[PDB]
């Protein structure tokens, strides 16, 4: 078929706006978790989150913003940053050969609260005629395609936590299959709202360490008690190798493998033994044509949950056996929390950055490491030149998506 | 790349539960549009819809129905119907080699209404712990996987009206790439609620011919005044040819092409000349390795909208030219309305049935043809064997997805 390489990184995260800011912040071990300021969460049991600080008006026409939900606002910003980072201009690209695939897990959460309120106080005939267009998941992809005139395939995947990776792997296929030569792919999420944090709180899936926001998300530690909700977006420029070299593009790495599986276990609980995750990682290795021992880094899913963090480690030890002990594993979520639908995309960015820069991002807050999970979780940034790395995403529902990256 | 064929059809529609009941209804030109009975619609400007009559308790365990949103229930029923129609028992397959891919355009609409009300009236701490697991779009695929223990890839597409086709096209790629040998793919939608119908009504997307429910959906006619919301699900068994042949599957048709594009034009307004629609159709044919001259039937998106229907006819004339006058075109929506996220899946089932049975389904209500739209819209069921057929889906947001089927 064709090789597919990453040539643009558009990162909008809780610890940095822009791919470079994100990388420097990772190396510093910065935390993007803080008391919630987006709205008054005093009445809630969870009052912390990884909020993004960005001026949309600095990227989009402030006049149009009013008809764009925050999740679409983040996707457009990340896509612009991505194109800029790739050194492209819509005009210098054949619009028919450019696809778009930015997924989301929830979509227009703020719009849902605003309009559902209208619906209740004034009736169904007072709902805004922009409700549907602002809230549905496919509007991130659609808006990006419309803004730049990209007429290549425009799709959207919604698989909760596996969204970002599923979307990237699906774009990988799109280019390998010849349906497009370049694709802006990734994920966006804007669910830091009363109803969403409330919902995840009543589900007991979130950390309640309101007293120490920056220390709440602590994956693989003995005191881990649930994840922290983050927000943001990750849009990467995927490109056929030939198209990249022909324009002299800076290549960050090559996307060589895509593996997926299903736990087929429970609605919100992952398989305690990581049987699904093990299967998805094994499929990513097979798809990329490499052996377990050729991998030197794994950007874990590690959301900081008792059952989940362990299921992953057990799955890693199962797939890498004797090699697991030689692996380096770190969780970006320790710093930016869980970006849900955007998680897989932004983490793919971090994973590509570690290969390109030759430095492995740390898993902060690893103060009380759990002895049952004997893997190297990189408590501090480490200079290392790996050839292959995996990016894991094991979502609610049982959707497992793994990406394999190769150092170019 | 292995050939992929359709070996099972699970249809849950407004005019028939079961692919067979659905086909007989089609040829009888039955209408599934009636006054809304799901809820009291007296305060709405649109009080009709294509409702499905089925008892989930006949397929699923009534105790677990309390925690399943209607869209998930519909997907399970269709999935069960598809496996039975394919002559398959969950244990007659390699669980790891079966994938799941059922999309939806909105997901848990009823759950959103009930829980947004709780949130607003009782507070974010009164929200049900099942809200998130019941409403997120990916739960149709997850639940089907959990029910049968299918551990192959489990993904979900959410691209408005293009959802059904996008999913099937994606499932096709899944099998062609070897990520699975069999996939239960399609779409589901359960959006007949006060908020949804009200939101589409304010957007002026729906017909208001409440006085003659059965005549409201009249695609390509002069007096068309918008679409009629439908509901249900379509789940098909896509299988690698050899896997099917070896087991003695009954093959309805072969899925040979999949084309996609984006209008990159307007949030809800379809490109006036059908530019995106035409590109998608051309792409599906090229993927199929066929030319416009070889197509004999097109299952139109044909929603019964003023701008929409004309745009599609325009795109058909552009891609097929003089052959456009020899082509047979029909809209399943004339009978079952617009199943939104399930539209393309249920219409793919109809297209496959047309090729397998050698009978072309009609477009009812063709009382006042639009002199501008002068193609053969098959007013009466017509016997005819065709070798190739297309099924179109051009959605809000500009997402265009087209499938191409081959007679066996
Ligand atoms: Mg009327």
Minimal C-alpha gap between B100 and chain A (Å): 9
Residues forming a β-bridge with A240: A4
Residues A225 and A251 both lie in one domain:
yes
Residues B218 and B275 both lie in one domain:
no
> Which element (helix H / strand E) includes A145?
helix A139-148
The Cα–Cα gap between A167 and A170 comes to 5
Please say whether the dihedral angle defined by the alpha carbons of residues B311, B313, B314 and B318, taken in this order, is positive or negative. positive
Residues B295 and B328 both lie in one domain:
yes
Residue B1 lies in a domain: no
Interface size A-B, in CB pairs within 8 Å, comes to 259
Q: How far is the CA of B34 from the centre of ligand 1 (A)?
A: 14
Q: Which of B144, B161, B244, B282 is catalytic?
A: B161
Token code pair at residue B93: 């397959």
Token code pair at residue A6: 């990453």
Q: CA distances (Å), B271 to each of B301, B331, B397, in order? A: 14, 20, 10
Token code pair at residue B231: 């509901």
Radius of gyration of chain B (CA): 20
Radius of gyration of chain A (CA): 20
The answer to whether B252 is a known catalytic residue is no
Q: Which residues of B108-117 are buried (b: 16+ CB within 10 A; e: fewer)?
A: bbbbbbbbbe
Nearest to B159, CA basis, from B347, B402, B322, B374: B402
β-bridge pairing B253-262 and B399-406:
antiparallel
CB atoms within 10 A of CB B289: 10
Residues A25 and A169 both lie in one domain:
yes
Q: Which of residues 180-199 of B touch A (CB under 8 A)?
A: 194-195, 197-199
Residue from the list B150, B177, B268 with its beta carbon closest to the beta carbon of A264: B150
Of B224, B259, B294, which marks where a domain is finished?
B259
Q: Which of residues 80-109 of B touch A (CB under 8 A)?
A: 95-96, 100, 105-107
- Please calculate the CA angle A393-A394-A398 and round it to the nearest 5 degrees: 145
> Which element (helix H / strand E) includes B133?
helix B131-135
Token code pair at residue A199: 């919902």
Of B231, B259, B287, which marks where a domain is finished?
B259
The Cα–Cα gap between A308 and A270 comes to 6
Token code pair at residue B22: 């659905």
The Cα–Cα gap between A388 and A327 comes to 11
Structure-token match 């490491």, residue found? A369
Nearest to A37, CA basis, from A195, A225, A205, A193: A193
The Cα–Cα gap between A42 and A62 comes to 30
The Cα–Cα gap between B177 and B172 comes to 9
Please say whether the dihedral angle defined by the alpha carbons of residues B374, B379, B384 and B386, taken in this order, is positive or negative. positive
Residues A197 and A324 both lie in one domain:
no
Reported in sequence order, the residue ranges of A115-231 that DSSP labels E, i.e. its strands, are 182-189
The DSSP output letter for A157 is: B
> Which element (helix H / strand E) includes B116?
helix B109-122
Token code pair at residue A388: 């292959």
Please say whether the dihedral angle defined by the alpha carbons of residues A188, A193, A199 and A204, taken in this order, is positive or negative. positive
| B242 exposure class (CB count in 10 Å sphere: 0-12, 13-18, 19+) | exposed
B152 → chain A, closest CA residue: A261
Residue B238 lies in a domain: yes
Residue A106 lies in a domain: yes
Question: Are A375 and A313 spatial neighbours (Cβ–Cβ below 8 Å)?
Answer: yes
Residue B136 lies in a domain: yes
The Cα–Cα gap between B211 and B391 comes to 31
Token code pair at residue B51: 């409702």
Residue A53 lies in a domain: yes
Polymer length of chain A: 408
Residue A1 lies in a domain: no
Residues B228 and B328 both lie in one domain:
no
Token code pair at residue A113: 């609260």
Q: What is the CATH number of the domain that holds A295?
A: 3.40.47.10
The DSSP output letter for A373 is: S
- Give the ranges where A264-342 is alpha helix by DSSP (H): 275-288, 306-324, 333-336
Residues A173 and A296 both lie in one domain:
no
Structure-token match 């400007």, residue found? B45
- Give the ranges where B187-327 is alpha helix by DSSP (H): 194-202, 241-247, 275-288, 306-320
Question: Are B354 and B332 spatial neighbours (Cβ–Cβ below 8 Å)?
Answer: no
Residue B128 lies in a domain: yes
Q: CA distances (Å), B40 to each of A123, B36, B43, B149, B257, in order? A: 13, 7, 8, 39, 43
Q: How far is the CA of A405 from the centre of ligand 1 (A)?
A: 57
The Cα–Cα gap between B319 and B272 comes to 15
Nearest to A276, CA basis, from A155, A395, A137, A103: A395
Structure-token match 């063709």, residue found? B366
> Which element (helix H / strand E) includes A246?
helix A241-246
Structure-token match 């929830």, residue found? A106
CB atoms within 10 A of CB A222: 13
A151 → chain B, closest CA residue: B262
CB atoms within 10 A of CB A173: 20
Count the alpha carbons within 13 Å of B188 in the hemisphere toward its beta carbon: 35
Residues A180 and A324 both lie in one domain:
no
Q: Which of residues 246-285 of A touch B (CB under 8 A)?
A: 260-268, 276, 279, 283
Residues B213 and B333 both lie in one domain:
no
Residues A254 and A320 both lie in one domain:
no
Residues forming a β-bridge with B103: B187
B158 inside 8 A of chain A by CB: yes
Contact A159 B154 (CB under 8 A): yes
Residue from the list A154, A197, A260 with its beta carbon closest to the beta carbon of B155: A260
Residues A201 and A82 both lie in one domain:
yes
Which domain, by its residues, includes B113? Answer: 6-259
Q: How many independent structural domains does chain A possess?
A: 2
The Cα–Cα gap between A201 and A220 comes to 21
Residues forming a β-bridge with B394: B400
Residues A288 and A244 both lie in one domain:
no
Question: Are B15 and B30 spatial neighbours (Cβ–Cβ below 8 Å)?
Answer: yes
Residue B26 lies in a domain: yes
Q: Which residues of B301-337 are buried (b: 16+ CB within 10 A; e: fewer)?
A: bbbbbeebbbbbbbbbbbbbeebbeebbbbbbbbbbb
Nearest to B45, CA basis, from B248, B203, B258: B203
The Cα–Cα gap between B363 and B51 comes to 19
Q: CA distances (Å), B90 to each of B138, B141, B168, in order? A: 21, 15, 21
Residues 6+ apart with CB under 8 A from A168: A185, A186, A236, A238, A255, A258, A344, A345, A348, A403
Which residues in chain A have Cβ-Cβ distances shorter than 8 Å to B283? 179
Please say whether the dihedral angle defined by the alpha carbons of residues A300, A305, A309 and A312, taken in this order, is positive or negative. negative
Nearest to A235, CA basis, from A74, A108, A390: A74
The Cα–Cα gap between B171 and A299 comes to 28
Experimental method: X-ray
- Please calculate the CA angle A385-A388-A393 and round it to the nearest 5 degrees: 120
Nearest to A51, CA basis, from A219, A197, A201: A197
Backbone torsions φ then ψ of A57, nearest 5 degrees: -60, -20
Question: Are A380 and A362 spatial neighbours (Cβ–Cβ below 8 Å)?
Answer: yes
Token code pair at residue A107: 């979509």
Report resolution in angstroms: 2.0
Of A259, A288, A319, which marks where a domain is finished?
A259
Q: CA distances (Å), A284 to each of A250, A262, A325, A392, in order? A: 25, 14, 20, 10
CB atoms within 10 A of CB A317: 19
Token code pair at residue A380: 């501090």
β-bridge pairing A388-394 and A297-299:
parallel
Question: Are A157 and A166 spatial neighbours (Cβ–Cβ below 8 Å)?
Answer: yes
Token code pair at residue A311: 């299921």
Could you tell me the maximum CA-CA distance found in chain A, to the nearest angstrom? 64
Nearest to B112, CA basis, from A347, A174, A108, A128: A108
């Amino acid at each position: 078929m064709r090789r597919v390489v990453v040539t643009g990184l558009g990162a909008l995260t809780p610890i940095g706006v822009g791919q470079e800011a994100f990388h420097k912040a990772q190396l510093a071990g910065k935390s993007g978790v803080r008391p919630i300021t987006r709205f008054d969460a005093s009445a809630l049991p969870v009052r912390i989150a990884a909020e993004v600080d960005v001026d949309p008006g600095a990227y989009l026409d402030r006049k149009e913003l009013r008809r764009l939900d925050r999740f679409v606002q983040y996707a457009l910003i990340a896509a612009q940053l991505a194109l800029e980072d790739a050194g492209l201009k819509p005009e210098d690209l054949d619009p028919e050969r450019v696809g778009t695939l930015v997924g989301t897990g929830i979509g227009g959460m703020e719009t849902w609260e605003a309009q559902s309120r209208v619906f209740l106080e004034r009736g169904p005939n007072r709902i805004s005629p922009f409700f549907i267009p602002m809230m549905i998941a496919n509007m991130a992809s659609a808006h990006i395609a419309m803004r730049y005139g990209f007429t290549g395939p425009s799709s959207t995947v919604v698989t909760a936590c596996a969204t970002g990776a599923d979307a990237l792997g699906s774009a990988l296929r799109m280019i390998q299959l010849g349906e497009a030569d370049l694709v802006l792919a990734g994920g966006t999420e804007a669910a830091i709202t009363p109803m969403a944090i409330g919902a995840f709180a009543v589900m007991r899936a979130l950390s309640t360490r309101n007293e120490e926001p920056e220390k709440a998300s602590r994956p693989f530690t003995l005191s881990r008690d649930g994840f922290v909700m983050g927000e943001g977006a990750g849009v990467l420029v995927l490109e056929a190798y030939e198209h990249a070299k022909k324009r002299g593009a800076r290549i960050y790495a090559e996307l060589v493998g895509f593996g997926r599986s299903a736990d087929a276990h429970h609605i919100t609980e992952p398989h305690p033994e990581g049987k699904g995750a093990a299967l998805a990682m094994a499929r990513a290795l097979k798809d990329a044509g490499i052996a377990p021992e050729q991998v030197g880094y794994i950007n874990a899913h590690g959301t900081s949950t008792p059952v989940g963090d362990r299921a992953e480690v057990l799955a890693i030890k199962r797939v890498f056996g004797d090699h697991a002990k030689r692996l380096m594993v770190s969780s970006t979520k320790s710093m930016i929390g869980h970006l849900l639908g955007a998680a897989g995309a932004v983490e793919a960015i971090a994973t590509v950055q570690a290969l390109y820069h030759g430095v492995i991002p740390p898993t902060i807050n690893l103060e009380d490491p759990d002895p049952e999970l004997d893997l190297d979780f990189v408590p501090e940034p480490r200079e290392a030149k790996v050839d292959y790395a995996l990016s894991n995403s094991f979502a609610f529902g049982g959707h497992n998506a793994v990406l394999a990256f190769k150092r170019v």
